[PDB]
Amino acid sequence: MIQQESRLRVADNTGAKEILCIRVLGGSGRRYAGIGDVIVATVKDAIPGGNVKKGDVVKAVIVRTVKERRRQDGSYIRFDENAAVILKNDGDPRGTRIFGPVGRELREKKFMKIISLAPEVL
Amino acid sequence: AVPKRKMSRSNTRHRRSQWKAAVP
Amino acid sequence: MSHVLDAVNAASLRSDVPAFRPGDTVNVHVRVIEGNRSRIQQFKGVVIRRQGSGVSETFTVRKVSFSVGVERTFPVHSPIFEKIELVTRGDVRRAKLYYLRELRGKAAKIKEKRE
Amino acid sequence: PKPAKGARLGGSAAHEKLLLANLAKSLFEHGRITTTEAKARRLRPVAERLITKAKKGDIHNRRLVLQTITDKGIVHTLFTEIAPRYAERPGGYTRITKIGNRRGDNAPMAVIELVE
Amino acid sequence: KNIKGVLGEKLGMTQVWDENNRVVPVTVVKAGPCVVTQVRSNDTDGYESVQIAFGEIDPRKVNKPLKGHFAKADVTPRRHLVEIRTADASEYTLGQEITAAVFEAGVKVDVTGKSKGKGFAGVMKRHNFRGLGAGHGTQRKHRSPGSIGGCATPGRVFKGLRMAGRMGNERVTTQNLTVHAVDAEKGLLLIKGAVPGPNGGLVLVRTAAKGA
RNA sequence: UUUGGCACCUCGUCGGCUCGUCGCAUCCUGGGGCUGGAGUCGGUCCCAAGGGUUGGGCUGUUCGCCCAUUAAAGCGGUACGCGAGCUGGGUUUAGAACGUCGUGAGACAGUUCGGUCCCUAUCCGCUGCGCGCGCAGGAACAUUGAGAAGGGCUGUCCCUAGUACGAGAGGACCGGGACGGACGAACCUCUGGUGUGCCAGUUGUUCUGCCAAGGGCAUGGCUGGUUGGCUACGUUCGGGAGGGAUAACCGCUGAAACAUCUAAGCGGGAAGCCUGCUUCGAGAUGAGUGUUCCCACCGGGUAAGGCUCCCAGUAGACGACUGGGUUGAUAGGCCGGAUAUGGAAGCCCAGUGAUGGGUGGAGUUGACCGGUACUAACGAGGGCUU
RNA sequence: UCGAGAGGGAAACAGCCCAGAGCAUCGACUAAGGCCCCUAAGCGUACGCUAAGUGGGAAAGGAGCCGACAAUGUA
RNA sequence: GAGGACCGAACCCACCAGGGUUGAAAACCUGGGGGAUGACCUGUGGUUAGGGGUGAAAGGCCAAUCAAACUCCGUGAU
């Protein structure tokens, strides 16, 4: 569960490192976002010379969460850190490389390019 | 708070009747 | 009055599972089902807890994949994994290995139990 | 034995343990004590468990009883006089009898004694 | 509309796994066997309904008025009675046994029972009121209701306003619970969800009131 | 609902939070007329108050601007609702300073830093719970429903279809599915939380004669776990469909006098109204209905059946409700399990020692489960008239 | 007129309509106002108008009607 | 091995918060907080008295009372 004023590590190479969650999309008053939920965030820390500069307002998809998430089969998955991937307006990732594992919840939500680029999907 | 009026004799005695002991 | 509850909690029970403990490295053969084709994903990691009762037993497996500590909690009797392979044994002195969340690298390794 | 709901006897959890431990001391010393009804009800399961441990009699159990009754003399009588008496009886080692309310605070009293 | 019903007794909850390997948390209901003891009708009693008597009680704890009411239908005295308000009560017969397997897998039921008690619940726990914040200097009102009305107009607390009172222990009916499995040997019902009332309570299971 | 005038009652202003409640002059959702309405979307107007109406930056702020969303971020009344409910930031005390005015004490709808917010609920009111009596015989059980309360929110994607519409760009009505947001209820199988209960490690000190093993205190000394219970961040479920009458509006037949939706009549027509769903419900004094039981005695004893007392929880502030009371598994204890911790004590072996290995998934162990009696279990004799 | 004025009427309503209380009265006639029931006395007699519950609130203006429209609950 | 030096108990004080508010207390309690070798704190004995005292200055303090103490008297003021 990631909410407003939450900070996420960026898992791709767009040049951003840390983003602050501005809002959770998909409903009025929506409170928490998990794996596969799209959010609006601001870039709080970025690599010098990268594409995205500190202060930019971006949309990012959450790919890891520290709060364990239940699956249909009864099993759960959790990670050690909260991470997201910055998207373009068309729903495609801005970066070209993705670091660390990602959750399988992306498949049903049609983030196929995220998955194809991810080193491992658990 | 404070009692607004002196309680009427009827109302006072309605209540004290409830303060009775039970036969053992 | 749960006298007859265990009768219903003795049909869904699994028997393939081995007898492992917390601190024992295992290899779970999860059965991923991507629509048409279903492969068998392999999850190798330490067993940091095992809690519950009867049909509700759940164990947790932990691994570090590309510098990220992933955890997966499975029901011991869930018809999701083909088989559980007890790889090694642990020499831990606890029952909930929750102190492995912050330890990283050489310090966060469980020692084999040489008999 | 199962813990108590609500307020602990004697005003604290720490006082309760030592309170029930010493009441058991007196019950084994004299075989019968008169005390408040609530205290008697709490004391029954504690004393009955101690007798169960004394029945077994081995050195290990003697440590375990000593964790509650620090008095070695009382424990000696427990293992050598009382436990042999109840060798055959399976539980229900104590008898609780209600008596009249106490003067002064109108606390309901009761007698708890070892079953002969 | 036709409504089949049977009394049960919630036994606990467990989980199962449907063929698609989806954990399905079920509650075990020991429904049956229960017998019809009286059939009401339009003429005799005004409406259409059917009593069913479920339970186990030795004949020594039943008083004579009930002991003679059971002997009219020629059934051993049970302990709990209820009526199912149906529309086809003329198809039943005194003494008929309603087994556990009146329902089959997939059907949706409307379970009913006495919800768990909660004592004299406070304002927040019983109506989800908010508080006045732990910090920033709140004087002994961290969990108070707040206000309860306006000033001189109307100069009165509206009826039906939400206060703190005894919570729970009242009749509750959960709806469209799915009957996962019906184990006809023991006479159980694996129902996907959470039926009201504590373990050992007397639940009632009747067909879906809605969707018919 | 503003700024005002009168001076008729009475010698903490504001803002925020909590909790409502009402109006419609409607922000969304629902229905419709016209359109300078090709389609998607709009403009205006008519009907419509059932529900819904987010989170932040600045400022005491209402207001206002802005950011990110949303189907939408409505306007108002209620002592500019609500301080015997909370705050006390501005504002109306005493301290001090700046600008200006004053010769001065001081003053300023100028500014600045600081500045005590009391109360045990008598009455009405509201939320729950009992006692008494009533309901013409006395009881046990189950219910009809006059009335009342609760709920009424909504999005995205797929098919229909890249179809009708169009220069094309774009792009439907209607109809059918899939998954969600917010809110509410029940529950504890799963996931998390607590744990003065349980298990283990360890610090200082003190005690049990000493070693060993343990107790007391130190926030449960601290720390690592944690069954039951209570829980939400967790699981499951709900908003509905349908029927009746309607608003705006759309019509059939049709005059008064060809035309007319109307003057007689007959239809369609809203998230709105009544039902349907959930719950309470015969003190509904209009006190109802059903099955069964007792039986026609002499102020009193009784029948059916209750109450008191005790053990408890499925209950609970106390009453109350539910089950059990030797014909007894109600509680405790005792046997076993499941859970929880995690390898007891003694002895042996290894080691100079701290320690390690074996005996042994050991010992301890509560609430969950199965067995087991060992302990404790006042109230009828039917009024009269037709 | 009240102030300093009782009594009857206007539902209640010091100042409006009728009427100025020395005291008693289980008699009668009237004033303002009324006469279907609440509530005393007319469902009065006869002619005509109103179809809007107008009567039981209101304008410019439009063809008795529309204009007509706020907040606790008919009001 | 100096210091109107540093940290910090006793001692002196009273910046913040909560409680208390017909209180345990007519000004306190609990947890934080400032000084803590100095212009410091404190005991005992003296001394300054009302348009007067004293005041590192708030109209502060002068017996729970101070923009002029308290008591008796003018006095049954107005």
Backbone phi and psi for residue A105, each to the nearest 5 degrees, phi listed first: -65, -20
Using the CA of D66, give the nucleotide whose C1' is nearest.
Answer: F214
Closest CA to C86 of C26, C41, C43, C46: C26
Nearest CA in chain A to E17: A73
Backbone phi and psi for residue E143, each to the nearest 5 degrees, phi listed first: -135, 25
Closest CA to E52 of E159, E205, E210: E205
* Beta bridge mates, E49: E40
For D47, residues 6+ apart whose C-beta sits below 8 A from its C-beta are D24, D27, D28, D93, D94, D112
Residue D23: CB atoms within 10 A of its CB come to 20
* Beta bridge mates, D65: none
Distance CA A67, CA A1 (A): 6
Distance CA B10, CA C3 (A): 61
Helix D59-66 crosses helix D37-56 at what angle (to 10 degrees)? 160
A116/E contact by beta carbon, under 8 A: no
Closest CA to E32 of E203, E211, E165: E203
Helix (H) / strand (E) containing B13:
helix B9-16
Distance CA A60, CA A54 (A): 15
Distance CA E142, CA E129 (A): 11
Residue E156: CB atoms within 10 A of its CB come to 9
Burial D49-75, CB ≥16 within 10 A → b, else e: bbbebbbeeeeebbeebeebbeeeebb
The half-sphere exposure of D85 on its side-chain side, counting CA atoms within 13 A, is: 14
Which bases of strand G sit closer than 7 A to a protein CB? Answer: 72
Quote the tokens at residue E26. 């079920």
Chain A residues touching C74 at Cβ < 8 A: 74-75
Alpha-carbon distance values, E104 to C55, E10, E84 (Å)? 24, 18, 19
Quote the tokens at residue E40. 């009401």
Q: Are A71 and A108 in contact (CB under 8 A)?
A: no
Residue A28 CA, chain-centre distance (Å), reads 20
Distance CA A25, CA A42 (A): 14
The single-letter code of the amino acid at E77 is P
DSSP-derived pairing of the beta strands A76-78 and A83-87: unpaired
Alpha-carbon distance values, D31 to D25, D65, D77, D111, E113 (Å)? 10, 17, 11, 10, 50
Q: Which long-range contacts (CB under 8 A, 24 or more apart) does D7-14 make?
A: D9/D38, D9/D39, D9/D42
Q: Are A15 and A50 in contact (CB under 8 A)?
A: yes
Scan for tokens 């799915």, then name that residue.
E178
Distance CA D39, CA D46 (A): 11
Residue A102: CB atoms within 10 A of its CB come to 29
Give the helix ranges, DSSP H, for chain C.
5-8
Solved using:
cryo-EM
Who among E9, E14, E199 is closest to C8 (CB)? Answer: E14
Q: Are E78 and E38 in contact (CB under 8 A)?
A: no
Helix D13-30 crosses helix D37-56 at what angle (to 10 degrees)? 70
DSSP E56: -
DSSP-derived pairing of the beta strands E108-114 and E177-181: antiparallel
C52 Ramachandran zone, left/alpha/beta (phi>0; psi -120 to 50) = left
C73/A contact by beta carbon, under 8 A: yes
Q: Are E3 and E86 in contact (CB under 8 A)?
A: yes
Distance CA D56, CA D83 (A): 8
Distance CA A82, CA A41 (A): 13
Query: Which stretches of chain E are assigned E, i.e. beta strand?
Result: 5-7, 10-17, 23-29, 34-40, 49-54, 80-84, 97-98, 108-114, 117-120, 166-168, 171-173, 177-181, 189-192, 204-207
DSSP A36: T
Nearest CA in chain E to C6: E14
Neighbours of chain E (3+ CB pairs under 8 A): A, C
DSSP-derived pairing of the beta strands E204-207 and A83-87: unpaired
Distance CA E104, CA E88 (A): 20
- Does residue D87 lie within 7 Å of nucleic acid chain F, judged by its CB? no
Question: By CB neighbour count within 10 A (0-12 exposed, 13-18 middle, 19+ buried), where does C21 fall?
Answer: middle
Quote the tokens at residue E144. 């108070």
The half-sphere exposure of D92 on its side-chain side, counting CA atoms within 13 A, is: 3
Distance CA D13, CA D15 (A): 6
Q: Are E110 and E175 in contact (CB under 8 A)?
A: yes
For C1, residues 6+ apart whose C-beta sits below 8 A from its C-beta are E9, E11, E199, E200
Chains B and A make contact, 3+ CB pairs within 8 Å: no
Give the helix ranges, DSSP H, for chain E.
42-45, 64-73, 123-127
Q: Are E69 and E77 in contact (CB under 8 A)?
A: no
Closest CA to E186 of A79, D59, C4: C4
Closest CA to C99 of C59, C51, C49: C49
Q: Is the bond leading into E154 cis (omega within 30 degrees of zero)?
A: yes
For C102, residues 6+ apart whose C-beta sits below 8 A from its C-beta are none
Nearest CA in chain A to E25: A74
Quote the tokens at residue D34. 């008169």
Q: Mark yes or no for CB contact A73/E15 under 8 Å.
A: no
- Does residue E139 lie within 7 Å of nucleic acid chain H, judged by its CB? yes
For C10, residues 6+ apart whose C-beta sits below 8 A from its C-beta are none
Distance CA E12, CA E203 (A): 12
Residues of E with a Cβ under 8 Å from any A Cβ are 15, 17, 21-23
Closest CA to A31 of A19, A20, A39: A39
Residue E116: CB atoms within 10 A of its CB come to 14
Q: How far is A54 from chain E (nearest CA, A)?
A: 35
Q: Are A9 and A17 in contact (CB under 8 A)?
A: yes
Residue D22: CB atoms within 10 A of its CB come to 14
Give the helix ranges, DSSP H, for chain D.
13-30, 37-56, 59-66, 72-77, 83-85
Backbone phi and psi for residue C43, each to the nearest 5 degrees, phi listed first: -120, 110
Largest CA distance in chain B: 39
Scan for tokens 């007798």, then name that residue.
D51
Quote the tokens at residue D28. 């084994």
